[PDB]
Amino acid sequence: EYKDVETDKKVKEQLGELMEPALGYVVKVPVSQSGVKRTEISNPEAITDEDLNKIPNYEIIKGVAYPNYGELVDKTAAETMKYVRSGYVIDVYHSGTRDKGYVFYKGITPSKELPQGPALTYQGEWDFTSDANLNNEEGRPTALNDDYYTTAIGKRAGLVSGDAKPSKHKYTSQFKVDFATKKMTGKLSDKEKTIYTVNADIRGNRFTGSATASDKDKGKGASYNFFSVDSQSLEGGFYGPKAEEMAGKFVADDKSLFAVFSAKHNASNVNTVRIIDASKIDLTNFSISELTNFGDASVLIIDGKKMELAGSEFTNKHTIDINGKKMVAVACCSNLEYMKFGQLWQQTEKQVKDNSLFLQGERTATDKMPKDGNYKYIGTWDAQVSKENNYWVATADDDRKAGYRTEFDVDFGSKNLSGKLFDKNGVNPVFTVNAKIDGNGFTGEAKTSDAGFVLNVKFSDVAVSGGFYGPTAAELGGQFRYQSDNGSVGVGAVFGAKQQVKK
Ligand code: NA
Numbered sequence: 151e152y153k154d155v156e157t158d159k160k161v162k163e164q165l166g167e168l169m170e171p172a173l174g175y176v177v178k179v180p181v182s183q184s185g186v187k188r189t190e191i192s193n194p195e196a197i198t199d200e201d202l203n204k205i206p207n208y209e210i211i212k213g214v215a216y217p218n219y220g221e222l223v224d225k226t227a228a229e230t231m232k233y234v235r236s237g238y239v240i241d242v243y244h245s246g247t248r249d250k251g252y253v254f255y256k257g258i259t260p261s262k263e264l265p266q267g268p269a270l271t272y273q274g275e276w277d278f279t280s281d282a283n284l285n286n287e288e289g290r291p292t293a294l295n296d297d298y299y300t301t302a303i304g305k306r307a308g309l310v311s312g313d314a315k316p317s318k319h320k321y322t323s324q325f326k327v328d329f330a331t332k333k334m335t336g337k338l339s340d341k342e343k344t345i346y347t348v349n350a351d352i353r354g355n356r357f358t359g360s361a362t363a364s365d366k367d368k369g370k371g372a373s374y375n376f377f378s379v380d381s382q383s384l385e386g387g388f389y390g391p392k393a394e395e396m397a398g399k400f401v402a403d404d405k406s407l408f409a410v411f412s413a414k415h416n417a418s419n420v421n422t423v424r425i426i427d428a429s430k431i432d433l434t435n436f437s438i439s440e441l442t443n444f445g446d447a448s449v450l451i452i453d454g455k456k457m458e459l460a461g462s463e464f465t466n467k468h469t470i471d472i473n474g475k476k477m478v479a480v481a482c483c484s485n486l487e488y489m490k491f492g493q494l495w496q497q498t499e500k501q502v503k504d505n506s507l508f509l510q511g512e513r514t515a516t517d518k519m520p521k522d523g524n525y526k527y528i529g530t531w532d533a534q535v536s537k538e539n540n541y542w543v544a545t546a547d548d549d550r551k552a553g554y555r556t557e558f559d560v561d562f563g564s565k566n567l568s569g570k571l572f573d574k575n576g577v578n579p580v581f582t583v584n585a586k587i588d589g590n591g592f593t594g595e596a597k598t599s600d601a602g603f604v605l606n607v608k609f610s611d612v613a614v615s616g617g618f619y620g621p622t623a624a625e626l627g628g629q630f631r632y633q634s635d636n637g638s639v640g641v642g643a644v645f646g647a648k649q650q651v652k653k
Contacts, residue, residue: 152526152650155624160487163353168383168401171356171444172196173454174256175399176206177408179240180282180308181250187284190405191308197256198454203228205239206254214249215241222251223312227275227412233257233389234397236412237277240310242299250307253279255397255410257389260444261355262426264393265417266516269328272396274413276323276338280309280376281406289370309376321345323411325396327352334359338411345377346409348384348400354445354512355426356387361400361409379404386411387444392422424591427511427617429629430494431642433534434505436633447490447510447619452477459490464548469497479508482530482546483646488512488620489627491644492532492546507532509644511619511627514590519623520562527558527626529647531571535607537639542605544573544580544643556645558626560587567592569628571645581643583614583628591617596630596643607639616645624649 174197182189197206205224215222225237240251283290283304290304300313311321325336325348334357338346343364350359361381368378379402386398395414402408428443442451448460453472459481460466469478474496481492489511495502531554533544547553555572557579569583580603585594595611602608609632616628626647633640 152528152652154485154528155649155651157487157620157622157624165358166383168194169358169385170196171354171385171387173198173200173258173260173442174206174235174254174397175410176252176254176256177279178207178252179238179250179279179310181247182282182284182306183247189282189308191279191281191401191408194399194401194408196454197254199256200258200454202233202235202256202258205235205252206256207252208239211239211241211249211251215244218246218248220244225277225312231274231395231412231414233259234395234412234414236275236397236410238279238310238312240312242312244307247306251310253277253310253408253410255386255399255412257387257395257397257412259389259391259440260442261388261390261393262428262440262443263391263422263424264329264355264388266329266421266423269326270415270417270420272325272327272336272413272415274323274396274411276321276409276411277311278321278376278407278409279311280304280408282306282308283406289374291372291374294372303374304376323413325413327396327415329393338409350384350386354443355393356385356444357396357398359384376407379406381407381409392420423513423516423589424617425513427489427509427513427619427627429509431507431629431631431644432504433507433536433640433642436631436637436640436642438629438631441508441510443510445512447488447512450479450481450490450494450508450510452494459492460484465492465546480532480546482532483548485648486529486625486627486646488625489646491627491629491646505534507534507629507642507644509627509629509646511617511625514618514620514623516589518621519590519618522563524559524561524563526650527556527560527647528650529556529558529645530554531556531643531645533571533641533643533645535603535605535641537605537607540605542573544571546646547574549574556647558583558647560626562587567594569645569647571596571643583630585614585616585628590623591615592626592628607641609634609639609641612641622649 224239234257236255332352384400428441570579571581
């Protein structure tokens with residue numbers, strides 16, 4: 151009597167290779183080997199690290215400069231930022247063909263909640279390394295002992311911002327960000343002069359755009375402008391639980407300059423709506439952890455590496471190898487486009503280590519949420535109930551008749567939600583859910599049958615949290631976890647359901 155609502159597929163926007171999101175990026179300062187005349191900015195290496203106080207490839211440049219009688223200096227902006235770092239680590243007494251250092255940015259906890267209201271002003275700093283260019287036609291200067299500590303400016307080795315004297319140069323960054331229009335503007339300035347202007351569109355908790363140069367004229371000699379070329383590849387992200395901070399980068403179009411930046415807003419009374427759900431329930435501790443997500447629920451991020459969850463069938467298995475070590479995940483479903491839920495474990499031996507459930511979803515815009523209507527949501531769920539050492543496991547399927555089903559009555563009018571979570575070939579539901587709808591989410595309680603559920607296990611009022619996903623809120627997802635005695639009985643469960651149309 152019910153079938154899935156005809157929905158338009160999620161529009162796939164192909165990025166370009168320099169616009170792939172990550173926790174951070176790092177670039178080795180260009181040093182022209184011999185007898186190369188021009189060494190361009192190489193490809194930015196992605197950072198998969200969640201340690202802020204760790205500078206990328208620090209031990210390498212350290213090991214290079216010191217036996218060569220050099221001294222390291224690092225600007226990471228750790229003195230002012232909480233969730234982000236940006237800047238450099240370079241060799242002050244660099245000469246010759248040995249490595250000079252790195253220019254980078256990184257951040258932790260990409261935002262799942264964005265501010266709501268007026269545009270925000272983020273303030274911070276930016277840094278940069280230039281390409282290396284020996285050619286005399288280029289006309290890069292020699293001996294500007296008033297501006298830089300360095301004799302040959304960007305010739306054998308790139309010009310880093312740390313080579314400049316503070317007496318004459320301060321590189322500041324300022325951005326104005328509207329999360330409503332999902333738009334961003336800003337300026338990268340030296341002292342009071344505007345070097346770059348930046349434009350960007352916000353998608354998820356990332357932003358992609360361009361940096362236009364204020365001074366297009368390259369010039370020559372002591373009047374050489376290292377910031378004449380634009381960049382159509384500015385990419386960054388918001389960090390902090392509520393987009394408290396932001397960091398990013400851009401590479402010049404002719405790869406003559408690579409610039410990084412970090413900034414933070416000071417705003418007083420910031421209201422936040424949620425945009426991203428990404429959670430992981432551990433099926434042993436029954437504790438819950440946040441997953442790193444950038445606004446694509448069909449992509450799971452573990453230890454920094456990327457595993458895509460979408461596939462050709464209803465539920466798809468995907469396997470990836472990370473630092474530790476080989477990870478497997480089963481993801482559902484194929485009819486869900488703005489959310490993904492499933493299982494996630496590590497395949498050590500037959501056995502599984504770190505068994506888990508996960509739920510990701512791209513929240514429905516708070517203004518896109520229906521205010522009137524009464525709908526039906528049919529879907530499925532993954533779960534694990536366990537008293538002592540015997541287990542009951544729910545595994546997502548497409549058997550709408552007699553599988554692990556989830557049925558939901560949703561009234562946007564009264565803002566009420568009810569749900570039934572079934573076992574395979576079960577007439578009466580194992581779990582019943584009663585939740586209240588607020589904004590683009592719902593919070594409520596789950597209870598067993600009034601007589602109990604035997605693997606006997608019985609409990610009432612376990613905290614259930616969920617949300618509506620997609621532009622039309624035609625998809626909903628949720629989760630609940632609980633344990634007693636710490637820990638005798640445990641329950642972990644995640645569910646998903648699609649909006650239905652009759653007949
Ligand atoms: Na503040």
